[PDB]
Assembly symmetry: C5
Homo-oligomer: 310 residues x 5
């Protein structure tokens, strides 16, 4: 088989569509997601073109019987697992191809606002031109969509749209036609509140009870113990995320909280030192100031951080 010949000099237009059946396994660390979808293709092959004499409105072909464009995905781990569903030819020779495929897609994620982040996942469709003729891709919006039951655990699916204009470019001395299918998602931040955020705030506030205690030994226990629990939360959080060349919102708060523990240790030390030196009136002034300063600076620093990130 060979490509359909051009009537004039026009490129062959392959109309495309992707209909999402299943979305699963959005892996934050790997920056991948798995997809199960319908891929629809349409092009004119005049060699395949009478409905009156044939009495048949449509002809069904097997993939091997006809010429089919070599369509690939750019951002996949391995080539897609595809099963042809149907091939239908209209009297004028317009071919309608439908396959169901599954693929693991590589799509970078922006963790800057984590866990209050949104992402635009991409599925890039591509075709390489043949020596005989140039192949160009188009979007049939009537064949772009997603099943209502499509659920991505821990995310809300906003939209699935295609950028209608392909990116046509040369690659290894041939033309290449690339389409961008976009899946907009937003993270379900709910669970982060009772599981990570609030527990982390509770332990921090517990360290601040040391500002109402003169017992150095109890203070050391309060600040050091809670710091260790903060380290456990820091480790827990970093296990759910990849290493980023930037600060994430959570990372910033987690990092800042270390400074609060560090300054609380200095305060607890200074307080004890003065007490030992028979200067408790002064220690009392530092401790009383700390009772206001620590929560106030904590609130303002968080307002500043939320402002820089959102």
């Amino acid at each position: 088989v060979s490509p359909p010949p051009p009537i004039a000099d026009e490129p062959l237009t392959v109309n495309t569509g992707i209909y999402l059946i299943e979305c699963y396994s959005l892996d934050d660390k790997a920056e991948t997601f798995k997809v199960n979808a319908f891929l629809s293709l349409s092009w004119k092959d005049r060699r395949l073109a009478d409905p009156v004499r044939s009495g048949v409105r449509v002809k069904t072909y097997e993939p091997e019987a006809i010429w089919i464009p070599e369509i690939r995905f750019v951002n996949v781990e391995n080539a897609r697992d595809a099963d042809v569903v149907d091939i239908s030819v209209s009297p004028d020779g317009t071919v309608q191809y439908l396959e169901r495929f599954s693929a693991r897609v590589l799509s970078p994620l922006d963790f800057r606002r984590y866990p209050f982040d949104s992402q635009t996942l991409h599925i890039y469709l591509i075709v390489r031109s043949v020596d005989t003729r140039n192949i160009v891709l188009a979007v049939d919006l009537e064949k772009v969509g997603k099943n209502d039951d499509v659920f991505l655990t821990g995310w809300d699916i906003e939209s699935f749209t295609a950028v209608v204009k392909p990116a046509n470019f040369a690659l290894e001395d041939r033309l290449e036609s690339k389409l961008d299918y976009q899946l907009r998602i937003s993270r379900q931040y709910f669970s982060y509140i009772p599981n990570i955020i609030l527990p982390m705030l509770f332990i921090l506030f517990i360290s601040w009870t040391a500002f109402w205690s003169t017992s150095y030994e109890a203070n050391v226990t309060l600040v050091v113990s809670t710091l260790i629990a903060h380290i456990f939360f820091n480790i827990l959080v970093e296990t759910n995320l990849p290493k980023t060349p930037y600060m994430t919102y959570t990372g910033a708060i987690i990092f800042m909280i270390y400074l609060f523990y560090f300054v609380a240790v200095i305060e607890v030390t200074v307080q004890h030192y003065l007490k030992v030196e028979s200067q408790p009136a002064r220690a009392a002034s530092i401790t009383r100031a700390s009772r206001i300063a620590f929560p106030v600076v904590f609130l303002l620093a968080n307002i500043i951080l939320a402002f820089l990130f959102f």
Copy 2:
């Protein structure tokens, strides 16, 4: 090969059945389960009809390639099913009986609201897309729906395996699609959660309450802080066995509430020490004595409220 032609304008009815051989790997975090089953298909193909007398046979056995077979797929699968055709049998009137053994990884959402005292309805959705030649509709042959008695899903009790007899017929890309819903009802075996997570978590909490019979601030700080850290370990342990949910689970609610009890116990321990240092131990004693009753009482009532909201 082409589909059986319609005598009038009727849709072709494909009778289906699923017989479960194996159920394994119910992954809570992934919301998947693996299945090994028999898939049975039956439809009328008049072009295959024969006379028993003339042929000298009452049944005809074909190879899948020799005859037309409907393109049946599963909606909620990761990848297409691994299937091996077992038998194809044709009766004199052209009634085809197809049997395949398949294995598949199924995506089926789980409701964790009552975890670990939860029940689930797992779904296996069978689907067929119509052809230009004709419309294909699915039906359930109840005589061919079932499960082996030895089918066990580790950590779960299997209640029933039934099919919703009426298919969901709908248009998808200007073609009729016919969808059947096979339902596997399961209930979680909550037993092990009691000695492994629930009771240990209650023991450490009750141990933090011994601080209400102690005037030693340093010992109290050690009791409340140490047990809080152990509670954090249980919280982490629990969340590793579960996916992130946009709602509160029953266990999650109790785990979260217990933090409030630790937080208030720290305030009490602090207030008690502060008053002692201020030479007002009589007040401190009143707060501590009240706490001995208040903490277990509020804990019990809060748990009755939570169990009520969840069950």
Copy 3:
């Protein structure tokens, strides 16, 4: 190809054998094990009879596609076996001798009641479904059932590999099925559990009992709470190596019971401090002295009771 025809009315007997080459990956949590073995099959197909004089050869070698081969499957597998045909030898009378080497991941439930001092009977179920033309039945050729001497299952001792000679013949989806049960008896190597989990867990418990020779409440709180936390770590460690069971395991029972000992030790430490503060140390001393004997004695008797209930 179609099945061999019956001389009279008898079912077709397919003689089977499994020879284990490798055993690996016994996964306790998954209740699976991987197997690499020879599967031997033998049946008479008179349509393959030949004259050694005419054909030159005394035994014919065939390709699987060239002749009729029974559709033999495993019941308790995750996916269909990975099989490679080693030989298909046909003798003059038409007796087929089929040999394949296969690898498969087998689902076989495990009884954890006596863990880590448990023994198991793993099963490999061979099955054949009957056809319309004729009924197929399985048999065991004991001469072709065995295992390589080098077969080792990491962390287990292999006792025996035998087959239940009588197949289980039954109806399934309006056809006959013939099922054979191959049994691999194994016993767990409990050795490593002693220095890694059991003894460390006993040492920390005995360390908490040193609080019965101390009047220091703050040190006692540190002794009992610290060791309890270490016990939680061991509890977590143990539960990671096991699936969730609707019953108590031997280890689980001991681990759970040890929490009660920590809980009562905290009460004792609290009661002792309370009396000391109330200026009644003579009483506190009587409780502490009694605890020095009571704790180890009750621990020993409770363990004798548990070992008795479990073994």
Copy 4:
């Protein structure tokens, strides 16, 4: 099919090119990375030559099976590459232009000496074996070597993708082999190691040094021992992200050295308490005051020495 015959006695030159589409999964522990790329091949096959005029075609397309194609392999791969032929074009003189898209898991050793401030040269080795008919040699077509601008390797910066133009020709199993070295230069994005591991580890160390402004032995023991345990947690965390090396890494050196600082701080805390108990606090005060300067000073100088030895 057989190799193109030599006009004289020359070896057959196969021109190669690799164009990277995707780079992912650089696994430090495994010392592997996954690659998705275009592999281009070019050679002259006189037997396929044609006249453009009498043919009416300027180029001729063939299926891989129709013509002779060199058996090109990768040396440093886990399994053979997953390849799909994209195009095979033949020009009038019989110059074949082959293009495939492949994916492979590549084994490439990493030097962790300067971790996490390290750079690496990943290798993709292309190989061809000679035939008895003729010697097959590889060449680099620089015009066909490159990478997509969107190529991102999570946690790394990609510097360059170049090929060593001169192949390494050598004998292997009595046939000559022609090997090309494609090099991907990368540098680690060390950013995240600063707020996640480096700074937290420094904070806990500095917190242990507050024991030099405390006379309370019990508080000092708590400060030094608690922070040491947190340092152990960071040590464990770091070693989980790395393979076992027969050398010291930069991070490993700092982590190891910090243990010595904790060990000496414990000795100081012990010596201080011992003297205090012996009624010699003046002395203990001299040791403690010296320690306040000595510990940070020795820490700074030791780090300058280490950075010097490693960079």
Copy 5:
């Protein structure tokens, strides 16, 4: 195709060779390693002989399907090898030279007795099953046994790759089997275990011994209990990198013994406090002073005894 016929009554000798290209993924817990290698085979097939002067061709290249090839398998593999035929060459006398490149996951038991100062002999067992026509025997062509210089197994030193030249010929299921043993000798790179596990574990133990220069019971309890917990973390860390063994490993022995030292140190700290409370500090002082010498001395001698028993 059928096997080459015997000139007299001789078995067919298949000469073998394995050339290692890649060694990776030595998994201690699984007792497996992955291999990528060349497998070379050579046998005489007279039915393929040709005249060198008449033919003009010195060697004839065949496709695997065109000629008879012996069914060579690996005994100790998880699944069948992934193999790609590289070349098939026939010399005038009919000597066949076969070459394939394969990849396989090999099961090979490991002896952990001296871990992490252990050495291993990994095995790759090559096997052939005889045919009815004739017996097939394996031989080693030492000229075709080897390994690439760049072959690196992360965390190990590769010593040698040799083959036991004499095959193990035996009957299995009424046919002869010919087995060859290819041995890869490796020694563990113990370096990293010193700064990561050994030294940190010794530091915490020595820190527990500072309690012998302290009269503070509460500080002593904190020193001994805290370091014991850190020792538990190292015990857990070590056991995660190892499978469960029915014997003691060298590291396991030291780790286990260190628990006894912690246990006795707790007894000493308890006895010391008890005597102090009983107003007998002169005695407590004698026990504490003795402990300062006894603990390090008994530790050193016990380690000399253990090293002696293990090495």
